[PDB]
Write a protein that binds this ligand. Sequence first.
Ligand SMILES: Nc1ncnc2c1ncn2[C@@H]1O[C@H](COP(=O)(O)OP(=O)(O)O)[C@@H](O)[C@H]1O
Ligand SMILES: [Mg+2]
Lengths: 222, 520, 371
Amino acid sequence: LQQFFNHHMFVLEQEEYKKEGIIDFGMDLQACIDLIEKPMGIMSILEEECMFPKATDMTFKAKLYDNHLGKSNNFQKPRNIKGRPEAHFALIHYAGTVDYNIIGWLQKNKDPLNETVVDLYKKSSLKLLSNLFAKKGSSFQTVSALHRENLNKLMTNLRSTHPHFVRCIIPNETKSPGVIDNPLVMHQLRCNGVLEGIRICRKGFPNRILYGDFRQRYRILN
Amino acid sequence: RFGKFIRIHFGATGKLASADIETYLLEKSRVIFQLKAERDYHIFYQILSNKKPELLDMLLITNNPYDYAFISQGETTVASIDDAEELMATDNAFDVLGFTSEEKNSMYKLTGAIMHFGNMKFKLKQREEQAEPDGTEEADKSAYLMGLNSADLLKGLCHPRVKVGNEYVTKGQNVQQVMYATGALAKAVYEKMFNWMVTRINTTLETKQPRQYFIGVLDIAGFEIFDFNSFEQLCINFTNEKLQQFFNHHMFVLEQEEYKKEGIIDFGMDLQACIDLIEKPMGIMSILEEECMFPKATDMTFKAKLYDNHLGKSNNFQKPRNIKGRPEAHFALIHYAGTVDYNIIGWLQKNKDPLNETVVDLYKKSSLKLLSNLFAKKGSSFQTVSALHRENLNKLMTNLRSTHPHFVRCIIPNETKSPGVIDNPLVMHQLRCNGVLEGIRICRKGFPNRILYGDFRQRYRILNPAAIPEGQFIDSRKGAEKLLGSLDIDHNQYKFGHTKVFFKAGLLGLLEEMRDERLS
Amino acid sequence: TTALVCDNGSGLVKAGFAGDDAPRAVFPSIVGRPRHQGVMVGMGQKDSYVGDEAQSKRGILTLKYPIEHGIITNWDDMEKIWHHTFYNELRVAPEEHPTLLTEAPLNPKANREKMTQIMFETFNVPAMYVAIQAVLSLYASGRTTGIVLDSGDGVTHNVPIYEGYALPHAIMRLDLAGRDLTDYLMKILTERGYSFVTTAEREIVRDIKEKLCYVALDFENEMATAASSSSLEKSYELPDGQVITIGNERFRCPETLFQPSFIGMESAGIHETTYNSIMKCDIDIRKDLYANNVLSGGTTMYPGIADRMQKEITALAPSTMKIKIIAPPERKYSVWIGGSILASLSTFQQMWISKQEYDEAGPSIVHRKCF
Ligand SMILES: Nc1ncnc2c1ncn2[C@@H]1O[C@H](COP(=O)(O)OP(=O)(O)O)[C@@H](O)[C@H]1O
Ligand SMILES: [Mg+2]
């Protein structure tokens, strides 16, 4: 979604800069998606890691360190501060260095759709008869794969539209007057992607001043 | 011997909620090693008393303090104390409190379980080193008293099994290390039982009010200077030394606050060097700890090493003068109480705490209270009384640095609970042993004479006035500047401020030697 | 801080913190490259299996020892052994930890200096030390005096120490040790019919050596017994089956410690290099050395080497002199445990070779006042 924001800002900022006569910003995020979406990426390595006979989660971390430690700039070893329980790899997203825990991804990644039980779901006299009514992945389709397809379908639904973003944040734990706790607003500054669109416009010229506006206020300068 | 710490816990806006205790520094060597002018803790003497015969039948005790090895190195009994009165205290506290009735049996089971440890011979095998108990009657009585097995205790004391890599290996021992093991397990289980009992009394003392922001009150033993200052006495002396170190910094922040209010080296450094001699590595507690690790290091070798490392190298450390026929003195530390000698002999035996691990496993397996009591690594086989003193004192310190002190001193008049026959050696000795004379002399290095300007004019304008009396017609800062401009006193003697004026110790008697010339 | 008492070893590597009974990480010092291809794709196997991970995958590896006889012969392997030791077995970064290494007597100077280069340059230890592997087994044994017999897996050295002063001249170093005994048991199990040429079963026959072998009290009497009787024919189960029945090849492997003429070693046994090491000392300190003969090292853990050693060293000594052998049942790890005594001493804090003391004087700082 933030990747759609960066291109969508770049086309508008490009429109004003071509009106005035004055690398894409989405590339700033693209590498992280390059680490995640593309084959030989972390979701793909997690998907194919299941297919092996005896591949445990420790073998999966060994394979991620085999493929991406130093090969890709986003992927980096996890520092653990303040007594986190365990951290196994870190991705510097647009929010920054974000660790992860491998343990148990191979159990939750799997979605083997048992076909004959789906046939018995069709045969049963209930709502399910109406609910459950080159092939790909009859025995090996994973939560990462349907996440990839549903996210691509949301994307191609969203690339056919024109966005108008709204952000919305909570003050603190209490539905309260002005006792706003700045760790929460500084954290949801980066988690909502607000600080990103703050810093993307800084790489161009954000100071958009009119000439007569520069003369009614800042001719006083010199 | 130990320290009390009674937190009277409050609420949010000062309403008494609860109270808890967490005692510090129960002396292990006091349990094992007793000086002839000293005694053990009272519980063993209570069971040795014939006040309750059911414990004597129960614990297989021979009615005699002289008989047992723990209770014969020291004194059996002294005047002004009665053992049946001590048991009269404990059965009153044991009959009604928060606990059940079985633990009243269990605590006595553990004390009389300590008693049968040390009598075991642990004879050396022929042409070997491993000490085999062949005289196994008394540790059999122990294993009946605890609930441990009879043979497993003897095998575990004789052959401690340790974990290497994955697979266990046993080591042997000699007679010496197994005697330090059978003392070390006793002192460890006694201190953990006593801390457990502090938690059991804490279960009674805690009530379900919301506990917040305690105003807790600690008690501790006094910095005591005998003719036989030993490592036991070092365990008191360095503790109260560190408490006095907290006092010097705590005075310095307050005196700094008033002197920065008025506009006028740290004092803790005055004590720091002594702690530098004791706490820091290559210090006397550290040299005593590493002295044990050598193969053949006796106490004479330890004194030779202390003289090698600190004679002249550190200003505190100095050779012991012996006056008035002290028995023997081996090194002297000028503490805040002054030159304090010490006796090396026997520190290496009482310093040791080798916690025998497989016997702790058998302590876990036994069906008693102990199953609940005894349930990068450091010092599995080399942990010492000095090390746990260092850690418990540091934990008391970081408990105490999170608080704000308000000191109370309390002294005895003399030996008799008496009217005014106070014997001045005792008050002069507890003047320095309580650290009172230190805080007396620390404030003297600044300006202690804290006099207000109008207070300097209502009383000491009489010293050198003008031709007109007081009247309150000059502002009191200038009304005292008019005074000090004619007292013939140099600038280095006083320091001028804003709200008050201060003077060095030795001036408010100079404010009356010429005033008696005025009042002649 | 805490100091790590490492031990390079020769067939086992033990590493633990100063302040423990036993070392926290004991594993063989092997580095195995995989010989075969790997038809399964995506398995992601490493180019170098090291340590105890390479003890479970032995039937596919070419196991190599980076320490042949005391000396490190391949440093690119020994760096992997140390890296696996700190990062995987102990899981501590050595940046904030001193490190006590233990190196045998009479090693090459370049071995000790190169070891110091690998410790300061690569791992960046703040202050390491290199201590003599026989003296630490005198710390652990609780003796101030006495000849110590550190029969390691790699090399066997008979250092004497009197009143804490080691005697440099009397130190006897013998190449014959547990590795060469394992090669000789590979040599004499072929005499029965069970072939062992692949180094992967080097760990099989050594395990036989751990279980079955024992030093016999007499040799010609036991060779007169095992050739006629069958009470010594003891079997063993290999990891596939075909249980093997070792008879007179049982006490004949560890006898090569006492008869080096079995494998063409010129020298006398370690029951006589001990005696030549005591006779090399002065003729007044010998009385404490005959009483305080220490045994240490994994190779000394045979059942009955403390009685055969005492029988032979009593047969060589003057018979009016008391013979006692101090061998606690932690013979193998006694080189480490005294190291856990060594780095835990407060007086040892001046002995560390600091990095500031290293960079001023280069790698030759080890043979100066700091050792
Ligand atoms: N219980 C045992 N009985 C006989 N031989 C043993 C035993 N344990 C170890 N060894 C032999 O001793 C060697 C391992 O001992 P160790 O002292 O750890 O060697 P290193 O010091 O070189 O690591 C191996 O060659 C092994 O076969
Ligand atoms: Mg060794």
